[PDB]
Coordinates of C-alpha atoms and ligand atoms in Angstrom, one line a residue:
Chain A
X1417 CA -106.4 -71.4 -88.2
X1418 CA -103.1 -71.8 -89.8
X1419 CA -101.2 -75.2 -90.0
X1420 CA -97.7 -76.1 -91.1
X1421 CA -96.4 -79.6 -92.0
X1422 CA -92.8 -81.0 -92.5
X1423 CA -92.5 -79.4 -96.1
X1424 CA -93.4 -76.1 -94.6
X1425 CA -90.3 -76.3 -92.3
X1426 CA -86.7 -75.9 -93.5
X1427 CA -84.2 -77.8 -91.2
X1428 CA -81.3 -75.2 -92.4
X1429 CA -82.6 -72.9 -89.7
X1430 CA -81.5 -75.2 -87.0
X1431 CA -79.0 -77.5 -88.4
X1432 CA -76.5 -74.9 -88.3
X1433 CA -76.8 -73.9 -84.5
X1434 CA -76.0 -75.2 -81.3
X1435 CA -78.8 -76.2 -78.9
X1436 CA -78.4 -76.2 -75.3
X1437 CA -81.5 -78.3 -73.6
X1438 CA -81.7 -77.4 -69.8
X1439 CA -83.5 -80.1 -67.8
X1440 CA -83.7 -83.8 -68.6
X1441 CA -87.0 -85.0 -67.4
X1442 CA -89.3 -86.8 -70.1
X1443 CA -89.4 -83.7 -72.2
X1444 CA -85.7 -82.8 -72.1
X1445 CA -85.1 -86.4 -72.9
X1446 CA -87.4 -86.5 -76.1
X1447 CA -86.1 -83.1 -77.2
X1448 CA -82.5 -83.9 -76.8
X1449 CA -82.5 -87.0 -78.1
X1450 CA -84.4 -86.5 -81.2
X1451 CA -82.4 -83.2 -82.1
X1452 CA -79.3 -85.5 -82.0
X1453 CA -81.0 -88.1 -84.5
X1454 CA -82.0 -85.3 -86.7
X1455 CA -78.3 -84.5 -86.6
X1456 CA -78.4 -81.2 -84.6
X1457 CA -75.3 -80.3 -82.4
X1458 CA -76.9 -80.5 -78.9
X1459 CA -75.9 -80.6 -75.4
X1460 CA -77.7 -81.0 -72.1
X1461 CA -77.2 -78.4 -69.0
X1462 CA -77.4 -80.1 -65.8
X1463 CA -76.2 -79.8 -62.4
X1464 CA -73.1 -81.8 -61.5
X1465 CA -73.8 -85.1 -59.7
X1466 CA -77.7 -85.3 -60.5
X1467 CA -79.7 -88.3 -61.2
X1468 CA -80.4 -86.8 -64.7
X1469 CA -76.8 -85.9 -65.3
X1470 CA -76.0 -89.8 -65.2
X1471 CA -79.0 -90.5 -67.2
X1472 CA -78.2 -88.2 -70.0
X1473 CA -74.6 -89.6 -70.4
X1474 CA -76.1 -93.1 -70.4
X1475 CA -78.2 -92.1 -73.3
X1476 CA -75.2 -91.1 -75.0
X1477 CA -75.6 -87.0 -75.1
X1478 CA -72.9 -84.6 -74.1
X1479 CA -73.5 -83.0 -70.9
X1480 CA -72.2 -79.9 -69.2
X1481 CA -73.1 -77.6 -66.3
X1482 CA -75.8 -75.2 -67.1
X1483 CA -73.6 -72.1 -67.1
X1484 CA -71.1 -74.0 -69.7
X1485 CA -73.8 -75.4 -71.8
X1486 CA -75.2 -71.9 -72.4
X1487 CA -72.0 -70.4 -73.1
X1488 CA -71.8 -72.8 -76.2
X1489 CA -75.2 -72.5 -77.4
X1490 CA -77.0 -70.4 -80.2
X1491 CA -80.3 -71.7 -79.0
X1492 CA -81.3 -72.5 -75.5
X1493 CA -84.4 -74.7 -74.8
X1494 CA -85.5 -74.6 -71.2
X1495 CA -87.3 -77.7 -70.2
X1496 CA -87.4 -77.3 -66.5
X1497 CA -90.8 -76.8 -64.1
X1498 CA -92.4 -73.4 -64.3
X1499 CA -91.3 -72.6 -60.5
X1500 CA -87.5 -73.2 -61.3
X1501 CA -87.2 -71.4 -64.5
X1502 CA -86.8 -67.9 -63.4
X1503 CA -84.0 -68.5 -61.1
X1504 CA -82.1 -70.5 -63.7
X1505 CA -82.6 -67.9 -66.4
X1506 CA -81.6 -64.9 -63.9
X1507 CA -78.5 -66.4 -62.5
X1508 CA -77.4 -68.9 -65.5
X1509 CA -78.9 -68.2 -68.9
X1510 CA -79.0 -64.4 -69.0
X1511 CA -75.5 -63.9 -68.3
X1512 CA -74.1 -66.3 -70.5
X1513 CA -76.3 -66.3 -73.5
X1514 CA -74.8 -64.9 -76.8
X1515 CA -75.9 -61.8 -77.9
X1516 CA -78.7 -62.3 -80.5
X1517 CA -79.1 -66.0 -79.2
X1518 CA -82.4 -67.8 -79.0
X1519 CA -84.2 -68.6 -75.9
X1520 CA -87.0 -71.4 -76.3
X1521 CA -89.8 -73.0 -74.2
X1522 CA -92.1 -75.7 -74.6
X1523 CA -94.6 -73.7 -71.8
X1524 CA -95.4 -70.1 -72.4
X1525 CA -96.1 -69.5 -68.3
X1526 CA -93.0 -67.9 -67.4
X1527 CA -92.6 -65.4 -70.3
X1528 CA -96.4 -64.9 -70.5
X1529 CA -96.5 -63.9 -66.8
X1530 CA -93.4 -62.1 -66.3
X1531 CA -91.4 -64.3 -64.5
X1532 CA -88.7 -64.3 -67.1
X1533 CA -88.4 -60.9 -68.8
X1534 CA -86.1 -61.8 -71.9
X1535 CA -83.1 -59.3 -73.0
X1536 CA -84.3 -57.4 -75.8
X1537 CA -81.6 -58.8 -78.3
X1538 CA -82.9 -62.3 -77.9
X1539 CA -85.2 -64.6 -79.9
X1540 CA -88.0 -66.0 -77.8
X1541 CA -90.2 -68.7 -78.9
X1542 CA -92.0 -71.7 -78.1
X1543 CA -92.4 -75.3 -79.4
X1544 CA -95.1 -77.4 -77.4
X1545 CA -95.9 -81.0 -78.5
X1546 CA -98.9 -82.7 -77.2
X1547 CA -99.3 -88.4 -84.5
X1548 CA -98.3 -85.9 -82.1
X1549 CA -99.1 -82.4 -83.3
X1550 CA -97.6 -79.3 -81.6
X1551 CA -97.8 -75.6 -81.0
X1552 CA -95.3 -72.9 -82.1
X1553 CA -95.3 -69.4 -80.7
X1554 CA -92.8 -66.4 -81.1
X1555 CA -92.9 -63.9 -78.3
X1556 CA -89.9 -61.8 -79.6
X1557 CA -88.2 -61.7 -83.0
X1558 CA -84.7 -59.9 -82.7
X1559 CA -83.2 -61.8 -85.3
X1560 CA -86.0 -61.6 -87.9
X1561 CA -85.9 -65.5 -88.6
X1562 CA -87.3 -66.8 -85.0
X1563 CA -90.3 -68.0 -86.8
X1564 CA -88.5 -70.3 -89.4
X1565 CA -85.9 -71.3 -86.6
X1566 CA -88.7 -72.5 -84.5
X1567 CA -90.4 -74.4 -87.4
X1568 CA -87.1 -76.1 -88.0
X1569 CA -86.8 -76.9 -84.3
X1570 CA -90.2 -78.6 -84.4
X1571 CA -89.6 -80.6 -87.5
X1572 CA -86.0 -81.7 -85.9
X1573 CA -87.8 -83.2 -82.9
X1574 CA -90.4 -84.6 -85.0
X1575 CA -93.6 -82.6 -84.3
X1576 CA -94.1 -81.3 -87.8
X1577 CA -95.4 -84.8 -89.1
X1578 CA -99.0 -84.5 -87.5
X1579 CA -98.9 -80.8 -87.8
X1580 CA -97.4 -77.5 -86.3
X1581 CA -100.3 -75.0 -85.2
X1582 CA -99.2 -71.2 -84.9
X1583 CA -100.4 -69.6 -81.6
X1584 CA -99.3 -67.2 -78.9
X1585 CA -97.6 -67.7 -75.5
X1586 CA -100.8 -66.0 -74.1
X1587 CA -103.1 -68.5 -75.8
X1588 CA -100.9 -71.4 -75.0
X1589 CA -100.6 -70.8 -71.4
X1590 CA -104.1 -69.5 -70.7
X1591 CA -105.9 -72.5 -72.4
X1592 CA -103.4 -74.9 -70.7
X1593 CA -104.1 -73.6 -67.3
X1594 CA -107.9 -73.4 -67.8
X1595 CA -108.0 -77.0 -69.2
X1596 CA -106.2 -78.4 -66.2
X1597 CA -108.3 -76.3 -63.7
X1598 CA -111.8 -76.7 -65.1
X1599 CA -111.8 -79.9 -67.2
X1600 CA -109.0 -82.3 -67.1
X1601 CA -107.6 -82.2 -63.6
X1602 CA -109.7 -80.1 -61.2
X1603 CA -113.0 -80.6 -62.8
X1604 CA -112.7 -84.4 -63.6
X1605 CA -111.4 -85.4 -60.1
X1606 CA -114.1 -83.6 -58.3
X1607 CA -116.8 -85.3 -60.5
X1608 CA -115.4 -88.6 -60.0
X1609 CA -115.1 -87.9 -56.5
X1610 CA -118.7 -86.8 -56.0
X1611 CA -120.0 -89.9 -57.7
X1612 CA -117.7 -92.2 -55.7
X1613 CA -118.9 -90.8 -52.6
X1614 CA -122.7 -90.7 -53.7
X1615 CA -122.6 -94.6 -54.2
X1616 CA -120.9 -95.3 -51.1
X1617 CA -123.0 -93.0 -48.8
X1618 CA -126.0 -95.0 -50.4
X1619 CA -124.9 -98.2 -49.1
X1620 CA -123.2 -99.7 -52.1
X1621 CA -119.9 -101.6 -52.0
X1622 CA -116.9 -99.4 -52.4
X1623 CA -115.3 -101.5 -55.0
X1624 CA -118.3 -101.2 -57.3
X1625 CA -118.3 -97.5 -56.6
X1626 CA -114.9 -97.4 -57.7
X1627 CA -115.7 -99.6 -61.0
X1628 CA -118.5 -97.2 -61.9
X1629 CA -117.0 -93.9 -61.3
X1630 CA -113.2 -94.4 -61.6
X1631 CA -112.2 -97.7 -63.6
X1632 CA -114.6 -97.2 -66.5
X1633 CA -113.8 -93.7 -67.3
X1634 CA -111.1 -95.0 -69.4
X1635 CA -113.3 -96.8 -71.9
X1636 CA -115.5 -93.8 -72.3
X1637 CA -112.8 -91.4 -72.8
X1638 CA -110.8 -93.5 -75.3
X1639 CA -114.0 -93.8 -77.4
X1640 CA -114.0 -89.8 -77.3
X1641 CA -110.3 -89.6 -78.1
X1642 CA -110.7 -91.9 -81.2
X1643 CA -114.0 -90.6 -82.4
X1644 CA -115.2 -87.7 -80.6
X1645 CA -118.4 -87.5 -78.2
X1646 CA -120.5 -88.6 -81.3
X1647 CA -118.5 -91.6 -81.7
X1648 CA -118.6 -92.3 -78.1
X1649 CA -122.5 -92.2 -77.9
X1650 CA -122.7 -94.4 -81.0
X1651 CA -120.6 -97.2 -79.4
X1652 CA -122.0 -97.5 -75.8
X1653 CA -125.5 -99.1 -75.5
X1654 CA -128.7 -97.1 -76.1
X1655 CA -129.6 -97.5 -72.3
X1656 CA -126.4 -95.7 -71.5
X1657 CA -126.5 -92.9 -74.3
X1658 CA -130.3 -92.3 -73.3
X1659 CA -129.1 -91.7 -69.6
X1660 CA -126.3 -89.6 -70.7
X1661 CA -128.7 -87.3 -72.6
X1662 CA -131.3 -87.0 -70.0
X1663 CA -129.5 -87.1 -66.8
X1664 CA -126.1 -85.3 -67.6
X1665 CA -127.3 -81.7 -67.3
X1666 CA -128.9 -82.7 -64.0
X1667 CA -125.2 -83.7 -62.6
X1668 CA -123.6 -80.9 -64.3
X1669 CA -125.8 -78.0 -65.3
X1670 CA -124.8 -75.8 -68.3
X1671 CA -125.2 -72.2 -67.1
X1672 CA -123.9 -72.4 -63.4
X1673 CA -120.8 -74.7 -64.5
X1674 CA -120.0 -72.3 -67.3
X1675 CA -120.4 -69.2 -64.8
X1676 CA -118.0 -70.8 -62.4
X1677 CA -115.5 -71.6 -65.3
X1678 CA -115.6 -67.9 -66.6
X1679 CA -114.4 -67.1 -62.8
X1680 CA -111.5 -69.7 -63.1
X1681 CA -110.6 -68.2 -66.5
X1682 CA -110.8 -64.6 -65.1
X1683 CA -108.3 -65.5 -62.4
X1684 CA -105.9 -67.1 -65.0
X1685 CA -106.2 -64.1 -67.4
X1686 CA -106.0 -61.4 -64.8
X1687 CA -102.6 -62.7 -63.5
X1688 CA -104.3 -63.6 -60.0
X1689 CA -103.4 -67.3 -60.4
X1690 CA -100.1 -66.8 -61.7
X1691 CA -99.3 -64.6 -58.4
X1692 CA -100.9 -67.0 -56.1
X1693 CA -98.8 -69.9 -57.4
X1694 CA -95.6 -68.1 -57.4
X1695 CA -96.1 -66.8 -53.9
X1696 CA -97.0 -70.5 -52.7
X1697 CA -93.6 -71.5 -54.2
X1698 CA -92.0 -68.6 -52.2
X1699 CA -93.0 -70.1 -48.5
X1700 CA -92.4 -73.7 -49.2
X1701 CA -95.7 -74.7 -51.0
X1702 CA -97.6 -75.4 -47.8
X1703 CA -101.0 -75.5 -49.7
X1704 CA -100.0 -77.9 -52.2
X1705 CA -98.4 -80.2 -49.6
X1706 CA -101.5 -80.0 -47.3
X1707 CA -103.9 -80.9 -50.2
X1708 CA -101.7 -83.8 -51.3
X1709 CA -101.8 -85.4 -48.0
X1710 CA -105.3 -85.1 -47.6
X1711 CA -106.3 -86.4 -51.1
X1712 CA -103.9 -89.2 -50.5
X1713 CA -106.0 -90.3 -47.6
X1714 CA -109.3 -90.2 -49.4
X1715 CA -110.8 -93.7 -48.8
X1716 CA -110.9 -93.8 -52.9
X1717 CA -107.5 -94.6 -52.9
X1718 CA -107.4 -97.4 -50.5
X1719 CA -110.2 -99.0 -52.6
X1720 CA -108.3 -98.1 -55.9
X1721 CA -105.1 -99.8 -54.8
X1722 CA -106.7 -103.0 -53.6
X1723 CA -108.4 -103.2 -56.8
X1724 CA -105.6 -102.5 -59.0
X1725 CA -103.7 -104.9 -57.2
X1726 CA -106.0 -108.2 -57.5
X1727 CA -106.4 -107.2 -61.4
Chain B
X169 CA -116.2 -108.0 -50.0
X170 CA -116.1 -111.4 -51.4
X171 CA -113.7 -112.4 -54.2
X172 CA -113.1 -115.7 -56.1
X173 CA -110.5 -116.8 -58.3
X174 CA -109.8 -119.7 -60.8
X175 CA -109.3 -122.3 -58.2
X176 CA -112.6 -121.5 -56.6
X177 CA -114.3 -122.4 -59.5
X178 CA -115.1 -125.9 -60.7
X179 CA -115.5 -126.3 -64.4
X180 CA -117.6 -129.4 -64.0
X181 CA -120.6 -127.2 -63.3
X182 CA -120.7 -126.0 -66.8
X183 CA -118.8 -128.4 -69.0
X184 CA -121.4 -130.9 -68.8
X185 CA -124.1 -128.5 -70.0
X186 CA -125.3 -127.1 -73.2
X187 CA -125.1 -123.2 -73.5
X188 CA -127.2 -121.0 -75.9
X189 CA -125.8 -117.5 -76.5
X190 CA -128.5 -115.3 -77.9
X191 CA -126.9 -112.2 -79.7
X192 CA -123.5 -111.9 -81.3
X193 CA -122.5 -108.4 -80.7
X194 CA -119.0 -107.9 -79.0
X195 CA -120.2 -109.8 -75.9
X196 CA -121.9 -112.6 -77.5
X197 CA -118.9 -113.1 -80.0
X198 CA -116.4 -113.1 -76.8
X199 CA -118.6 -115.2 -74.6
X200 CA -119.2 -117.8 -77.3
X201 CA -115.8 -118.2 -78.6
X202 CA -114.2 -118.4 -75.1
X203 CA -116.8 -121.1 -74.2
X204 CA -115.9 -123.1 -77.2
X205 CA -112.2 -123.0 -76.5
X206 CA -112.8 -123.8 -72.8
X207 CA -114.6 -126.9 -74.4
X208 CA -118.1 -126.0 -73.5
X209 CA -120.8 -127.5 -76.0
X210 CA -122.2 -124.0 -77.2
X211 CA -124.4 -122.7 -80.0
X212 CA -125.4 -119.1 -80.9
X213 CA -129.2 -118.2 -81.6
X214 CA -129.8 -115.8 -84.1
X215 CA -132.3 -114.8 -86.6
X216 CA -131.9 -116.2 -90.1
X217 CA -130.1 -114.1 -92.8
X218 CA -128.7 -111.6 -90.2
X219 CA -125.2 -109.9 -90.4
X220 CA -124.3 -111.6 -87.4
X221 CA -125.5 -114.9 -88.5
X222 CA -122.9 -114.9 -91.2
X223 CA -120.2 -113.6 -88.9
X224 CA -120.8 -116.3 -86.2
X225 CA -120.6 -119.2 -88.9
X226 CA -117.5 -117.7 -90.2
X227 CA -116.1 -117.8 -86.7
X228 CA -116.7 -121.4 -86.7
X229 CA -119.6 -121.5 -84.2
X230 CA -122.8 -123.6 -84.5
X231 CA -125.8 -121.2 -85.3
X232 CA -129.3 -122.0 -85.1
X233 CA -132.8 -119.8 -85.0
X234 CA -133.3 -118.6 -81.4
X235 CA -136.2 -120.9 -80.7
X236 CA -134.2 -123.9 -81.7
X237 CA -131.0 -123.0 -79.8
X238 CA -133.0 -122.7 -76.7
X239 CA -134.7 -126.0 -77.0
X240 CA -131.3 -127.9 -77.3
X241 CA -130.0 -125.6 -74.1
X242 CA -129.4 -126.3 -70.5
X243 CA -128.1 -122.8 -70.1
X244 CA -129.4 -119.6 -72.0
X245 CA -126.8 -116.7 -72.0
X246 CA -128.9 -113.4 -73.3
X247 CA -126.4 -111.1 -74.7
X248 CA -128.8 -108.6 -76.6
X249 CA -129.6 -104.7 -76.0
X250 CA -131.8 -104.2 -72.9
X251 CA -134.7 -103.0 -75.0
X252 CA -134.8 -106.1 -77.0
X253 CA -134.6 -108.6 -74.2
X254 CA -138.2 -108.6 -73.0
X255 CA -139.7 -109.8 -76.3
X256 CA -137.1 -112.2 -76.9
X257 CA -137.7 -113.8 -73.5
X258 CA -141.4 -114.0 -73.7
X259 CA -141.9 -115.2 -77.1
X260 CA -138.7 -117.5 -77.6
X261 CA -137.2 -118.3 -74.7
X262 CA -139.9 -119.0 -72.3
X263 CA -141.8 -121.5 -74.1
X264 CA -138.6 -123.4 -75.3
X265 CA -136.5 -123.5 -72.2
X266 CA -136.3 -126.9 -70.3
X267 CA -137.7 -127.1 -66.8
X268 CA -135.2 -126.4 -64.3
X269 CA -133.1 -124.5 -66.7
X270 CA -130.6 -121.6 -66.4
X271 CA -131.4 -118.2 -67.4
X272 CA -128.1 -116.0 -67.5
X273 CA -127.3 -112.3 -68.3
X274 CA -124.5 -110.1 -68.6
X275 CA -126.6 -107.0 -67.3
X276 CA -129.3 -107.1 -64.5
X277 CA -131.4 -104.3 -65.8
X278 CA -134.4 -106.6 -67.4
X279 CA -134.8 -108.7 -64.5
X280 CA -134.2 -106.1 -61.7
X281 CA -136.7 -103.8 -63.2
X282 CA -139.3 -106.6 -63.8
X283 CA -139.2 -106.5 -67.8
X284 CA -138.3 -110.1 -67.5
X285 CA -140.1 -112.3 -65.0
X286 CA -138.5 -115.6 -64.9
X287 CA -140.6 -118.9 -64.2
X288 CA -140.1 -120.1 -61.0
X289 CA -138.3 -123.4 -61.9
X290 CA -135.3 -121.5 -63.5
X291 CA -132.2 -120.7 -62.1
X292 CA -131.2 -117.1 -62.9
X293 CA -127.9 -115.6 -62.8
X294 CA -125.4 -113.1 -64.0
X295 CA -121.6 -112.8 -65.2
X296 CA -120.5 -109.5 -65.9
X297 CA -117.1 -108.9 -67.3
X298 CA -115.5 -105.4 -67.2
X299 CA -106.7 -108.4 -66.0
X300 CA -110.5 -108.0 -66.6
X301 CA -112.4 -108.9 -63.3
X302 CA -116.1 -109.9 -63.4
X303 CA -119.3 -109.7 -61.2
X304 CA -121.3 -112.5 -60.4
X305 CA -125.0 -112.6 -58.9
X306 CA -127.6 -115.1 -58.6
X307 CA -131.2 -113.9 -58.7
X308 CA -133.0 -117.3 -58.5
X309 CA -131.5 -120.7 -57.4
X310 CA -134.2 -123.3 -58.3
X311 CA -131.7 -126.2 -58.9
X312 CA -129.5 -125.6 -55.7
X313 CA -126.5 -125.1 -57.8
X314 CA -126.7 -121.7 -59.5
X315 CA -123.9 -119.9 -57.9
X316 CA -121.1 -122.7 -58.7
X317 CA -122.5 -123.0 -62.5
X318 CA -122.3 -119.0 -62.5
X319 CA -118.7 -119.4 -61.2
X320 CA -118.0 -122.2 -63.8
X321 CA -119.3 -120.1 -66.4
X322 CA -117.3 -117.2 -65.4
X323 CA -114.1 -119.3 -65.3
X324 CA -114.8 -120.9 -68.8
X325 CA -115.1 -117.4 -70.4
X326 CA -112.0 -116.4 -68.7
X327 CA -113.0 -113.6 -66.3
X328 CA -111.9 -115.9 -63.2
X329 CA -108.4 -114.9 -63.5
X330 CA -108.2 -111.4 -62.5
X331 CA -111.1 -112.2 -59.8
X332 CA -114.9 -112.6 -59.8
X333 CA -116.7 -110.5 -57.3
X334 CA -120.1 -111.4 -55.9
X335 CA -122.9 -108.9 -55.9
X336 CA -126.6 -108.7 -56.8
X337 CA -128.6 -107.8 -59.8
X338 CA -130.0 -104.8 -57.8
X339 CA -126.4 -103.2 -57.1
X340 CA -124.8 -104.1 -60.7
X341 CA -127.8 -102.5 -62.1
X342 CA -128.1 -99.5 -60.2
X343 CA -124.4 -98.7 -59.7
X344 CA -124.0 -99.3 -63.8
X345 CA -126.8 -96.9 -64.6
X346 CA -125.5 -94.4 -62.0
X347 CA -122.1 -94.4 -63.1
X348 CA -123.2 -93.9 -66.9
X349 CA -125.6 -91.0 -65.8
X350 CA -123.6 -89.2 -63.2
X351 CA -120.0 -89.6 -64.1
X352 CA -118.9 -91.7 -67.1
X353 CA -121.0 -90.4 -69.7
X354 CA -123.6 -87.6 -68.8
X355 CA -121.5 -85.6 -66.2
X356 CA -118.1 -86.2 -68.2
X357 CA -119.8 -85.0 -71.5
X358 CA -121.1 -81.9 -69.9
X359 CA -117.9 -81.0 -68.1
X360 CA -116.1 -81.2 -71.4
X361 CA -118.7 -79.1 -73.2
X362 CA -118.7 -76.5 -70.6
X363 CA -115.1 -76.0 -70.8
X364 CA -114.9 -76.2 -74.7
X365 CA -117.5 -73.6 -74.9
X366 CA -116.3 -71.1 -72.1
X367 CA -113.0 -71.0 -74.4
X368 CA -114.6 -70.4 -77.4
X369 CA -116.7 -67.8 -76.1
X370 CA -113.6 -66.1 -74.6
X371 CA -112.1 -65.7 -77.8
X372 CA -109.6 -68.5 -77.9
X373 CA -109.3 -70.8 -81.2
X374 CA -111.5 -73.9 -81.2
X375 CA -108.7 -76.0 -81.9
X376 CA -106.8 -75.2 -79.0
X377 CA -110.1 -75.4 -76.9
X378 CA -110.6 -78.7 -78.2
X379 CA -107.2 -79.8 -77.2
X380 CA -107.4 -78.5 -73.6
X381 CA -110.8 -79.7 -72.9
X382 CA -111.3 -83.0 -74.9
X383 CA -108.1 -84.4 -76.4
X384 CA -106.0 -84.3 -73.4
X385 CA -108.4 -86.0 -71.1
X386 CA -106.9 -89.1 -72.0
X387 CA -103.6 -88.4 -70.7
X388 CA -105.0 -87.9 -67.2
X389 CA -107.5 -90.7 -67.4
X390 CA -104.8 -93.2 -68.4
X391 CA -102.8 -91.9 -65.3
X392 CA -105.9 -92.4 -63.1
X393 CA -106.4 -95.7 -64.5
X394 CA -103.1 -97.0 -63.8
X395 CA -102.5 -95.3 -60.6
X396 CA -105.4 -93.5 -59.1
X397 CA -105.9 -89.9 -58.4
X398 CA -102.9 -90.1 -56.3
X399 CA -100.8 -91.2 -59.1
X400 CA -102.3 -88.8 -61.5
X401 CA -101.5 -86.0 -59.4
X402 CA -97.9 -87.2 -58.7
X403 CA -97.3 -87.5 -62.6
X404 CA -98.4 -84.1 -63.8
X405 CA -96.7 -80.6 -63.2
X406 CA -97.0 -79.2 -59.9
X407 CA -98.5 -76.3 -61.5
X408 CA -101.3 -78.3 -62.9
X409 CA -101.7 -80.2 -59.4
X410 CA -101.8 -76.9 -57.6
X411 CA -104.5 -75.8 -60.2
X412 CA -106.5 -79.1 -59.7
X413 CA -106.6 -78.7 -55.8
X414 CA -107.5 -75.0 -55.7
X415 CA -109.9 -74.5 -58.7
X416 CA -111.4 -78.0 -58.9
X417 CA -114.1 -77.3 -56.3
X418 CA -115.0 -74.1 -58.1
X419 CA -115.8 -75.8 -61.3
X420 CA -117.8 -78.7 -59.7
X421 CA -118.5 -78.0 -55.9
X422 CA -119.0 -81.1 -53.9
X423 CA -122.2 -80.5 -52.0
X424 CA -124.5 -79.3 -54.6
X425 CA -123.0 -81.8 -57.2
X426 CA -123.6 -84.4 -54.8
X427 CA -127.3 -83.3 -54.1
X428 CA -127.8 -83.5 -57.8
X429 CA -126.3 -86.9 -58.1
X430 CA -128.5 -88.2 -55.3
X431 CA -131.6 -87.4 -57.2
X432 CA -130.2 -89.0 -60.4
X433 CA -129.7 -92.2 -58.1
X434 CA -133.1 -91.9 -56.6
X435 CA -134.8 -91.7 -60.0
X436 CA -132.8 -95.2 -60.8
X437 CA -133.7 -96.9 -57.3
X438 CA -137.4 -95.6 -57.7
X439 CA -138.0 -97.3 -61.0
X440 CA -138.6 -94.1 -62.6
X441 CA -135.6 -94.2 -65.1
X442 CA -136.6 -97.6 -66.1
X443 CA -140.2 -96.7 -66.7
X444 CA -139.2 -93.6 -68.6
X445 CA -136.7 -95.6 -70.7
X446 CA -139.0 -98.5 -71.6
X447 CA -141.9 -95.9 -72.5
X448 CA -139.5 -94.1 -74.6
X449 CA -138.8 -97.2 -76.6
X450 CA -142.5 -97.9 -76.9
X451 CA -143.0 -94.9 -79.3
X452 CA -139.9 -95.1 -81.2
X453 CA -137.4 -93.3 -79.1
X454 CA -137.9 -89.8 -80.2
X455 CA -136.0 -88.2 -77.4
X456 CA -133.1 -90.5 -77.7
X457 CA -133.2 -89.7 -81.6
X458 CA -133.6 -85.7 -81.2
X459 CA -130.8 -85.6 -78.6
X460 CA -128.7 -87.6 -81.0
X461 CA -129.1 -85.1 -84.0
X462 CA -128.8 -82.0 -81.6
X463 CA -125.4 -83.1 -80.1
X464 CA -123.9 -84.5 -83.7
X465 CA -124.5 -80.8 -84.8
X466 CA -122.4 -79.2 -81.8
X467 CA -119.5 -77.4 -83.1
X468 CA -117.1 -79.1 -81.1
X469 CA -117.7 -82.3 -83.6
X470 CA -116.8 -80.1 -86.5
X471 CA -113.7 -79.1 -84.7
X472 CA -112.8 -82.5 -83.5
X473 CA -113.2 -84.3 -86.9
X474 CA -110.9 -81.9 -88.6
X475 CA -108.2 -82.2 -85.6
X476 CA -108.2 -86.1 -85.6
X477 CA -108.1 -86.1 -89.3
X478 CA -104.8 -83.9 -89.4
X479 CA -103.1 -86.1 -86.7
Ligands
MG2742 MG1 -97.6 -63.1 -76.8
MG2743 MG1 -131.4 -109.2 -56.8

């Protein structure tokens, strides 16, 4: 798989261009500040009187309404939540973006699942940071220089150091949603919760349940992060390693789990997940909100709060 | 549940006593150094010509053979791997420990599962560190002051600050083994591996598979560590939160998972796990070793190594 570094990227493909960063969350913040520091002509498009409007000015960046920022720009980088992007593109980017302009993202969801259908004259590309490596993709190369522009942008925000990996909007979006659903968030919270409940129902103090099923996860994952599974197994006690090897499959059996995870991936790949999430947003996200309240009330949180407090 | 702090512990119950720390891993190191710094009379019992022998002297601690260290001690703190403790106790602690001495641990496994059967004249207790709180337990109080000694020991190594929680050898050992098996190590590695394989078999680049199923786990777990599930859900994108809520149970279903985890706990509570692990050690740990080689060869490691290298 193809990796690019600082020397592979040519800042001449960006330094000559005016960049509009829409949004000023953590991503909008980091993108905009690093562009300026790399000496790119950058403005931030925000709604007047917003909290992030004041915050952007405070950081010393030039700030305009979204429509204005876009009229000024050669390159529009959209750093807004997925569910807000479509409306902003339709009503404010698309009428105001120069012929042959570039439209950029950090997440491929909106373009990959057809929520934003870019004008045919635009370049469309993505730089997705994570020694922070980054992913790059080009969905549409109208100018003929989409790719070197994207690479220049990546260097200019500092992602090139640890390496830029070329992918597609498809691969970035699908694997991102899969990871969240199956492993990182969905799967992990369910494992933790089943373990916590198992211990509490068996008569153990909730505090110790929380230690052994929640608090300690960080120790293990930090080892994996630094040195892979192999390194994690090497650092823990032999008792714990033996336990892992011999009981792990009982907790989480391989073929049944992969079967389920294939169905999660199928709902992603088929467009079904995307449809469901977009429809959910059209009627005020009541499933999101109901689930949020219900998980907030889970006894794991009470115990968690009390323990973090006393530590 | 009952919590103790620095003001609840009285260093007079330890400062008057000679402590032998057997072993000089990370725990033996931290225990011994902090005891000395709190002004406790401490020696480290090690085998002559060992790597940890030289390392202990280098740190400025007084070092003796195990038999000698024990003859000098009022309190013997055993900080060795589970599978080595029994032999050292039988052959070197038990013949040499004063009448009415104290025998201490950081892990309850050996005493809880009968691998060490302490003389009836001994105090037996445990201080188990994790703003590092600690667990304390007393298995045997021959002197009548086991508990305040244990608390003094905990303060003297610095565990009292963030709080000492009173438990039993039983609860500490069983929940520790359960967490390892079901969630922290066994369960988590299986989830990660099923997700990684799902993505690779579906045609995605292994690099991105690794990002979305392994590398990123740290971001999520760091949020949970700092602010619980609730806080983690609050920080991630709404798309990711919605995903978690609606697909997590498919990946890891609640009742089947808890059923399996009850069986893991039953094998712990029944003594079966302890028996298996002890027998395993009696014939050179061939299951441990076979599993270690097989997991080392899993393609997740190759991909992992290459990615960590380039970052
Ligand atoms: Mg594509
Ligand atoms: Mg007990």
